[PDB]
Amino acid sequence: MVENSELRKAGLKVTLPRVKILQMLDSAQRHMSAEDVYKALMEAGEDVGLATVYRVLTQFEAAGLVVRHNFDGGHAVFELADSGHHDHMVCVDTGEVIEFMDAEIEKRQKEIVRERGFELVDHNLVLYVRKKK
Template identity: 65%
Template sequence: IGLATVYRVLTQFETAELIIRHNFEAGYSVFEMAPDDHHDHMVDVDTNEVIEFIDEEIERRQHMIAEQHGYEIIDHTLVLRVRKKDRA
């Protein structure tokens, strides 16, 4: 299978909402199966490792802030760029 075929199929899966593409500032994309629940990401700036996490308090605060300004959140992405403390 050629690389062009792989990218075409990934695009089709993305359009069908079977997968989600995450574009990170380092110039690369990561695909993951469309999750059943919302989660956010941390990206290790030294290794580019992507760590998923769920924090209900962060989610609650984001919705509260949007509501205080007269908005509702339709969608959002939270990416924390992190570095292990022992590598700083």
């Protein structure tokens, strides 16, 4: 299965809890907390406890299958890494998260780093915003 390959490529043994959580992440909320995953699983009548959900998502994060972000300061969001790249705009007053991808900034980041003798390994860009209105 595709999930099995993803887990193996990530140096992680294939297990039922690991497969169900990855499937939950695949189907979307784009930015889910550990509780959102747990609640979705419980709705689906599954049998995975919250602590296990958090543990697995942390295993996925360390492995590179997911990225963990904290946009409102008070909770962690976990989202797949495999998906197309996206940086984020966060509405400070409401907590609304808006993904974006600007090719100009992406190429400028590469230029900045390369002209210094480096290679860009990863990056994080968050723009905190408020409606002009």
